[PDB]
Enzyme design. Structure first.
Site, PDB file in Angstrom:
ATOM      1  CG  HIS B  14      60.699  20.538  36.951  1.00  0.00           C
ATOM      2  ND1 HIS B  14      61.373  21.531  37.626  1.00  0.00           N
ATOM      3  CD2 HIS B  14      60.204  19.696  37.867  1.00  0.00           C
ATOM      4  CE1 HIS B  14      61.272  21.278  38.921  1.00  0.00           C
ATOM      5  NE2 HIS B  14      60.589  20.160  39.085  1.00  0.00           N
ATOM      6  CG  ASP B  16      63.084  24.074  40.338  1.00  0.00           C
ATOM      7  OD1 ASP B  16      62.636  25.180  40.766  1.00  0.00           O
ATOM      8  OD2 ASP B  16      63.175  23.028  41.036  1.00  0.00           O
ATOM      9  CE  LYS B  17      67.524  21.220  34.571  1.00  0.00           C
ATOM     10  NZ  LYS B  17      68.331  22.413  34.203  1.00  0.00           N
ATOM     11  CD  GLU B  42      70.467  33.543  40.199  1.00  0.00           C
ATOM     12  OE1 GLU B  42      70.091  32.546  39.555  1.00  0.00           O
ATOM     13  OE2 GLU B  42      71.522  33.576  40.867  1.00  0.00           O
ATOM     14  CD  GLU B  55      73.398  40.430  40.662  1.00  0.00           C
ATOM     15  OE1 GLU B  55      74.011  39.376  40.375  1.00  0.00           O
ATOM     16  OE2 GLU B  55      72.479  40.473  41.503  1.00  0.00           O
ATOM     17  CE  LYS B 166      60.717  16.128  40.387  1.00  0.00           C
ATOM     18  NZ  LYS B 166      60.597  16.547  41.798  1.00  0.00           N
ATOM     19  CG  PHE B 235      51.244  16.005  37.424  1.00  0.00           C
ATOM     20  CD1 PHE B 235      51.277  17.392  37.531  1.00  0.00           C
ATOM     21  CD2 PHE B 235      52.447  15.342  37.212  1.00  0.00           C
ATOM     22  CE1 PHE B 235      52.482  18.078  37.408  1.00  0.00           C
ATOM     23  CE2 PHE B 235      53.638  16.031  37.059  1.00  0.00           C
ATOM     24  CZ  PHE B 235      53.654  17.397  37.190  1.00  0.00           C
ATOM     25  CG  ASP B 243      57.069  23.039  42.764  1.00  0.00           C
ATOM     26  OD1 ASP B 243      57.124  23.499  43.902  1.00  0.00           O
ATOM     27  OD2 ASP B 243      57.995  22.419  42.235  1.00  0.00           O
ATOM     28  CB  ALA B 244      57.621  28.602  43.287  1.00  0.00           C
ATOM     29  NE  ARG B 249      65.558  24.838  45.339  1.00  0.00           N
ATOM     30  CZ  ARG B 249      64.495  25.316  45.974  1.00  0.00           C
ATOM     31  NH1 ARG B 249      64.441  26.580  46.341  1.00  0.00           N
ATOM     32  NH2 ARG B 249      63.513  24.499  46.315  1.00  0.00           N
ATOM     33  CE  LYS B 250      64.103  19.570  40.079  1.00  0.00           C
ATOM     34  NZ  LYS B 250      64.081  20.385  41.310  1.00  0.00           N
ATOM     35  CE  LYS B 270      75.608  31.180  39.047  1.00  0.00           C
ATOM     36  NZ  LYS B 270      76.240  30.269  40.021  1.00  0.00           N
ATOM     37  CE  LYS B 274      78.901  36.302  36.877  1.00  0.00           C
ATOM     38  NZ  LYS B 274      79.264  37.477  36.054  1.00  0.00           N
ATOM     39  CG  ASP B 276      79.327  28.666  41.161  1.00  0.00           C
ATOM     40  OD1 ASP B 276      80.109  28.070  41.929  1.00  0.00           O
ATOM     41  OD2 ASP B 276      78.515  29.525  41.508  1.00  0.00           O
TER      42      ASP B 276
END
Ligand code: SAM
Ligand code: SAM
Ligand code: YMW
Ligand code: YMW
Ligand code: CL
Ligand code: CL
Lengths: 380, 380
Positions: B14, B16-17, B42, B55, B166, B235, B243-244, B249-250, B270, B274, B276
């Protein structure tokens, strides 16, 4: 019975939020010319660079250089001294048509009301009677602190401010049969980009007196409230130079500040056929309609979809104990009153209208009487 | 008492993954050489392109071309026929040092235990006794369906499969004093990229017989279960070409599939400073420790931080009614047993170890006995 809860917000010049606003400026530019544009526009920002990446199929003729640069101008990044300048940054475009395979499975040769969901996924809506706009106080206050910073930047009274900011508000609450009742503000964080010349004491004094006191009612502030104002001690480097931005990386800021739930989908840069946006807006509309209709003091709504299928695969309700009616009853009321096909949502919420850039800072919900904020009157 | 709940998962290919896995491959490459690397990487993916943006301040010498391409190879994008090829794609790098302003406010000249949080933010941890691994059944099943697709792709038994997939699982539950009890699977969605030659009937039959039946216990499937298998009908175009993709985003796939809550922060790319990531891992560890310790059947934990401040600004507990102890009591137990400063979390959860790429598909929680999955024994 007391407990703490924390939410954050970010300003218009936060690098992730820059990307959301550019993505929605691009969407709006397309919709102005082609109400049926298929748009999936991601934005990436780093030092000196805005990159557009994604998929757009549209009859519009859009000048991406102009749209991007005007959006950055509006945000306030207009000089190399601030770390970013709309006049001189790089704008790179990696945009292609929507996949034909997606198009054929979602919308081509389909009646608009019967278009398929543009993807699978799950979405939630939430509402709470703790504020008049049916939003959590934590995030309302966090958003208003960022708005106040932008106001005082733009009006020239704190000219050392720059566009990149973050805020965070911890509220102390009590509860009554599942409803939540704000008592006081426990902790506030504000971090905001600033010029080289201003000192920490000047900034911290201004943030308390001209920002916090101008936003947060005094009845919520007391001697015990904790203030973390410019806690990093220095924030001259900011915007994309300080931290890369991407579209769809502030999805909790965009929604309920940790309250409720989230299905994971980003809003900005997507037309109504992307249920990540349209169904989340509709779910907010449902939740707010239940609360404003007096059926519950707080409520969470889940919906879910399959790509190419119009009707939701599931709908679920959680009322936190704040209704005399069962969750089953509330679900039946929702099903009798709402049609959550994307091709019907678009009509009810007017989702071809180019108002999306206005949604992309300060939260998508609880503001401006957008269509999803106007309760539907329920029959039951 | 019955209700539905839906969660989704995505496969290793996928888009994003792909980005999450590349971001964590970069993190791991740095940590192999410099355990104290500061990493905020990123990844963006679109047709023919991997872009790294962010960074990094590190003593490591990392070959980004090699790291990126090896990660894409592992995922399985190795030919133009599949839409993406590690051998021939573009790898672009827009990486700079960590902001000196952040560095000075977070970690420079600080004792490791007393390092500041690398940002503000809020994070949640969740656990539920409905499965042995203390995760929601909805997402466990969704993850396992994607893992099964990858297995049958890699072993050559369904050679028409490609890496992008998915899945989505709706479970029908009942409840008992706040605990949730799976009954049956109501709906399953599977969409997976495929070659030009295989037909829908062959694919749908295989997805039911070789994927769903190999994953989902028959006791949960019945005549009423709804199957949406290849619901878009085609598909062939997939991965970044379809798809970008972007890192982070997941975030709901990465966590609890809509259950619990989320504070908005992404994990991949990260280092431990971080919060997060580190504080979300610690919050999972707390939640799982409370459930495995017999104090509650389900629990949600919130924590929050300010940039540059080591101790959390707030900690909160919600037990859904599944404890005899009050939420206040549970909070006191947490505070007596855990130290949630990032510079202590790093020691407890061994967060300088380069295992992050293994976290970046199939969820960060409920797998592999990572340190945050090994309950802490509680004193109370
Ligand atoms: C702290 S940065 C995230 C970590 C960063 N990527 C790194 O390299 O460590 C996240 C956000 O915090 C804000 N920020 C940037 N520099 C900051 C500073 N010096 N002090 C406080 N907040 C800062 C900006 O809004 C930025 O988008
Ligand atoms: C449907 S695409 C999102 C919408 C897309 N950006 C557009 O331009 O409409 C989201 C994800 O669904 C999957 N996908 C891509 N093409 C698909 C297709 N033809 N059928 C089903 N799923 C597809 C991939 O996993 C992709 O990352
Ligand atoms: C009945 C008053 N109350 C307390 C909470 C809560 N509602 C709530 O919805 N949530 C909540 C927020 C988001 C998702 N699930 C529960 C809480 C979450 C935490 Cl960690 C701690 C306390 C609460
Ligand atoms: C007591 C059994 N039960 C039912 C639900 C639920 N727990 C829950 O945690 N959640 C839940 C999930 C995530 C955030 N808050 C509540 C539900 C959410 C929805 Cl929309 C519908 C039903 C539930
Ligand atoms: Cl951020
Ligand atoms: Cl997606």
């Amino acid at each position: 019975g007391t407990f703490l809860f924390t939410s954050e917000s970010v300003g218009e010049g936060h690098p992730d939020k820059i990307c959301d606003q550019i993505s929605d400026a691009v969407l709006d530019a397309h919709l102005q010319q082609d109400p049926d544009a298929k748009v999936a526009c991601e934005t990436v920002a780093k030092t000196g660079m805005i990159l557009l990446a994604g998929e757009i199929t549209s009859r519009a003729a859009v000048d991406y250089q102009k749209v991007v640069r005007e959006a950055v101008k509006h945000i306030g990044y207009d000089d190399s001294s601030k770390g970013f300048d709309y006049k001189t940054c790089n704008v790179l475009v990696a945009l292609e048509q929507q996949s034909p395979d997606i198009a054929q499975g979602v919308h081509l040769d389909r009646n608009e009301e019967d278009i398929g969901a543009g993807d699978q996924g799950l979405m939630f809506g939430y509402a709470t009677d703790e504020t008049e706009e049916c939003m959590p106080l934590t995030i309302v206050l966090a958003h208003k602190l960022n708005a106040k910073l932008a106001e005082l930047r733009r009006n020239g009274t704190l000219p050392w401010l720059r566009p990149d900011s973050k805020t965070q508000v911890t509220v102390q609450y009590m509860q009554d049969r599942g409803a939540v009742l704000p008592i006081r503000v426990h902790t506030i964080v504000i971090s905001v980009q600033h010029d080289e010349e201003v000192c920490l004491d000047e900034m911290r004094d201004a943030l308390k007196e001209k920002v916090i006191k101008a936003v947060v009612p005094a009845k919520y502030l007391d001697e015990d409230t904790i203030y973390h104002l410019q806690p990093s001690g220095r924030f001259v480097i900011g915007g994309p130079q300080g931290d890369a931005g991407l579209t769809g990386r502030k999805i909790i800021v965009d929604t309920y500040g940790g309250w409720g739930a989230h299905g994971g989908g980003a809003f900005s840069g997507k037309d109504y056929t992307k249920v990540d946006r349209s169904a989340a807006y509709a779910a907010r509309w449902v939740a707010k309609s239940l609360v404003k209709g007096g059926l519950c003091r707080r409520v969470l709504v889940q919906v879910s979809y399959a790509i190419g299928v119009s009707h939701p695969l599931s709908i679920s309700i959680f009322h936190y104990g704040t209704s005399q009616k069962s969750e089953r009853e509330l679900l039946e009321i929702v099903k009798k009153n709402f049609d959550l096909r994307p091709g019907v949502i678009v009509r009810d919420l007017d989702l071809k209208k180019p108002i999306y850039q206005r949604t992309a800072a300060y939260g998508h919900f609880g503001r401006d009487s957008f269509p999803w904020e106007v309760p539907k009157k329920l029959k039951y």
